[PDB]
Amino acid sequence: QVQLVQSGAEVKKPGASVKVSCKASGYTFTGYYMHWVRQAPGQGLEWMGWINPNSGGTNYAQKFQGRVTMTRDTSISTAYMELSRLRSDDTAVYYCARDGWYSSGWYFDSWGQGTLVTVSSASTKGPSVFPLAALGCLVKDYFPEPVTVSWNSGALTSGVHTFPAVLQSSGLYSLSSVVTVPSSSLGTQTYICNVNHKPSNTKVDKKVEP
Amino acid sequence: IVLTQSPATLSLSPGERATLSCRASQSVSSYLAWYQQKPGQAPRLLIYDASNRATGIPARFSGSGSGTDFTLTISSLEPEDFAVYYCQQYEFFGQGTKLEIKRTVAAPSVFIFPPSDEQLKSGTASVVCLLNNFYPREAKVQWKVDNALQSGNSQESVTEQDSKDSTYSLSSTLTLSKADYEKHKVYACEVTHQGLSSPVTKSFNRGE
């Protein structure tokens, strides 16, 4: 069984460079081309280039040419993709994909899990958690993605809606997590939202009360 | 060069047949491929060589077409078959077609939330309008401050189509400064949705 495991997410300032790894297993590493496809949030797929792990030869997309470098290390069956002089619009999920077909075209039968690369001139910051006294929590002004919100340490799951984050003009993200409950338990059942923003090691328990 | 997919969004119920189009501007090789991408996951290969099913792909998936027009067909839509679908040939991808579950219309449950006191102590006031569990997703939320329309000072977010009830939820946030927030009395969000006979307005006053 084929597996493509990529490196964790990264956060970079505009102008800096990022390097993503992609370790392969379950097949002859030097026997199949490795491609790199990215996907901006909400947008479609975009081919960047491929590398022949046997030869080491490359073929970069016309728009990433002169900014991308694709290498490989056969001894560890790992491919690399370095994108330098980054811009804000380079924020995307970066995938490594194996093309398994000698004939015909490029058919990507195995993909990595992706590596989110956030490129922004903003600095990291923990969120401000404000209650929404249906009740919820407002996870405002944080950077970068993501944040994980649970209610009562995951004991409460039914009726919970955690909305996708929005990028505010300030460069910071913000989302809301609401939940619907019977009105009989409001003066009795205690409702706490647990916000966890790993990038800043910020954890907030906020008791929502009418 | 560009691959154009049609339609941009396709909404059908489980059990029906969905047909996705992928046209090429130039007449190009019939070495097309179709992929399936669910939210938060990588694309999965479905069709290759325009009409060959990949490994582990159910028989309901089928592809056809050559030259400049290509099609992907699914016979009976299963709830697991609703996602985004891209066509690709060599280094060129299509913008994608989203396949959503068509559901019986449901009106949104509208709620409004005044800014919390903690935020007000920080000099900012965020008012949140919640639209819970509705279908379809095309809804218009408009903020009214003292019954006057707002613009340019709000943002909204919509969840992915729920897997349990096939509904959507929308969260809109109006953000003002404490000063500008206290210069006005009635804050409202007016929801327009085809499940609603008339636009619904949820409001509150700064007191109580």
Tab-separated table of C-alpha atoms in Angstrom, chain B residues 65-192:
chain	number	residue	atom	x	y	z
B	65	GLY	CA	-15.992	11.776	-24.488
B	66	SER	CA	-12.922	12.654	-26.521
B	67	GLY	CA	-11.441	15.555	-28.459
B	68	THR	CA	-12.763	18.767	-26.898
B	69	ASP	CA	-15.691	17.543	-24.754
B	70	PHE	CA	-15.474	15.096	-21.853
B	71	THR	CA	-18.078	13.857	-19.393
B	72	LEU	CA	-18.117	12.128	-16.025
B	73	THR	CA	-21.295	10.218	-15.186
B	74	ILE	CA	-22.486	8.663	-11.932
B	75	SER	CA	-25.491	6.366	-12.250
B	76	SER	CA	-27.085	6.401	-8.776
B	77	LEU	CA	-25.821	9.111	-6.434
B	78	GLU	CA	-24.786	7.721	-3.081
B	79	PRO	CA	-24.448	10.088	-0.093
B	80	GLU	CA	-20.710	9.347	-0.118
B	81	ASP	CA	-20.481	10.580	-3.735
B	82	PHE	CA	-21.197	14.262	-2.974
B	83	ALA	CA	-18.046	16.389	-3.142
B	84	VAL	CA	-15.925	18.460	-5.549
B	85	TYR	CA	-14.839	16.954	-8.870
B	86	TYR	CA	-11.923	18.160	-11.001
B	87	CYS	CA	-10.973	17.149	-14.530
B	88	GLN	CA	-7.297	17.116	-15.441
B	89	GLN	CA	-5.142	16.320	-18.460
B	90	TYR	CA	-1.359	16.664	-18.172
B	91	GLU	CA	-0.521	19.861	-16.230
B	92	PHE	CA	-3.961	21.473	-16.642
B	93	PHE	CA	-6.818	21.367	-14.128
B	94	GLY	CA	-10.398	22.583	-14.260
B	95	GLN	CA	-11.923	25.023	-11.788
B	96	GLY	CA	-14.050	22.183	-10.412
B	97	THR	CA	-17.710	21.292	-9.981
B	98	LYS	CA	-19.272	20.933	-6.538
B	99	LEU	CA	-21.809	18.133	-6.119
B	100	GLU	CA	-24.214	18.797	-3.240
B	101	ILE	CA	-27.223	16.903	-1.896
B	102	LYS	CA	-30.489	18.459	-3.069
B	103	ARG	CA	-32.769	18.685	-0.078
B	104	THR	CA	-36.325	19.738	0.600
B	105	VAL	CA	-36.307	23.459	1.321
B	106	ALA	CA	-35.895	24.408	4.965
B	107	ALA	CA	-36.111	27.919	6.458
B	108	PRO	CA	-33.231	29.198	8.634
B	109	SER	CA	-33.502	29.545	12.390
B	110	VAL	CA	-32.421	33.167	12.846
B	111	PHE	CA	-30.705	34.293	16.044
B	112	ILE	CA	-28.913	37.520	16.937
B	113	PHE	CA	-26.271	38.058	19.614
B	114	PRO	CA	-25.409	41.440	21.173
B	115	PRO	CA	-21.739	42.136	21.900
B	116	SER	CA	-20.480	40.681	25.150
B	117	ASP	CA	-19.475	42.999	27.973
B	118	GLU	CA	-15.889	41.709	27.868
B	119	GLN	CA	-15.445	42.841	24.265
B	120	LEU	CA	-17.109	46.169	25.076
B	121	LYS	CA	-14.435	46.726	27.722
B	122	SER	CA	-11.822	46.358	24.955
B	123	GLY	CA	-13.342	49.106	22.796
B	124	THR	CA	-14.937	46.902	20.120
B	125	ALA	CA	-18.491	45.687	19.537
B	126	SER	CA	-19.303	42.623	17.425
B	127	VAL	CA	-22.935	41.730	16.701
B	128	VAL	CA	-23.500	38.195	15.406
B	129	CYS	CA	-26.466	36.967	13.354
B	130	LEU	CA	-26.902	33.189	13.149
B	131	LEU	CA	-28.753	31.315	10.398
B	132	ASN	CA	-29.026	27.707	11.555
B	133	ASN	CA	-29.794	24.671	9.392
B	134	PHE	CA	-31.306	25.886	6.117
B	135	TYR	CA	-31.462	24.866	2.465
B	136	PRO	CA	-30.487	25.988	-0.156
B	137	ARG	CA	-27.369	27.958	0.835
B	138	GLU	CA	-28.127	31.035	-1.298
B	139	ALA	CA	-29.290	33.446	1.407
B	140	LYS	CA	-28.989	37.209	1.834
B	141	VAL	CA	-28.258	38.705	5.256
B	142	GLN	CA	-28.496	42.479	5.660
B	143	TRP	CA	-27.803	44.388	8.871
B	144	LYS	CA	-30.095	47.206	10.002
B	145	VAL	CA	-28.943	49.737	12.609
B	146	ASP	CA	-31.850	51.925	13.699
B	147	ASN	CA	-33.654	50.389	10.707
B	148	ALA	CA	-30.946	51.751	8.378
B	149	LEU	CA	-28.947	49.458	6.108
B	150	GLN	CA	-25.296	48.603	6.751
B	151	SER	CA	-22.498	47.921	4.295
B	152	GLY	CA	-18.746	47.402	4.285
B	153	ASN	CA	-18.410	46.664	8.018
B	154	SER	CA	-19.486	43.004	8.208
B	155	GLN	CA	-18.309	39.541	7.189
B	156	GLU	CA	-20.088	36.190	6.965
B	157	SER	CA	-19.104	32.520	6.911
B	158	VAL	CA	-21.023	29.429	5.776
B	159	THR	CA	-20.442	25.841	6.869
B	160	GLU	CA	-20.120	22.873	4.545
B	161	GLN	CA	-23.292	20.950	3.782
B	162	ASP	CA	-24.143	18.917	6.871
B	163	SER	CA	-23.946	15.136	6.494
B	164	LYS	CA	-26.912	14.512	8.830
B	165	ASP	CA	-29.585	16.887	7.505
B	166	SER	CA	-27.929	18.198	4.296
B	167	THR	CA	-28.424	21.781	5.521
B	168	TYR	CA	-26.181	24.835	5.749
B	169	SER	CA	-25.505	27.334	8.514
B	170	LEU	CA	-24.454	30.966	8.128
B	171	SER	CA	-22.735	33.228	10.655
B	172	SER	CA	-22.533	36.964	9.961
B	173	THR	CA	-20.572	39.362	12.170
B	174	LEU	CA	-21.016	43.134	12.269
B	175	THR	CA	-18.008	44.821	13.889
B	176	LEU	CA	-18.139	48.392	15.187
B	177	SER	CA	-16.230	50.436	17.738
B	178	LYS	CA	-17.712	50.812	21.211
B	179	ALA	CA	-18.268	54.499	20.444
B	180	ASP	CA	-20.171	53.931	17.196
B	181	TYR	CA	-22.041	51.020	18.798
B	182	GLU	CA	-23.373	53.180	21.641
B	183	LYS	CA	-24.541	55.955	19.285
B	184	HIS	CA	-27.381	53.705	18.040
B	185	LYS	CA	-30.287	51.829	19.603
B	186	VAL	CA	-31.814	49.038	17.478
B	187	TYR	CA	-29.550	46.427	15.870
B	188	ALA	CA	-31.126	43.935	13.470
B	189	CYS	CA	-30.280	41.466	10.722
B	190	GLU	CA	-32.785	40.949	7.906
B	191	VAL	CA	-32.702	37.430	6.453
B	192	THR	CA	-34.057	36.646	2.980
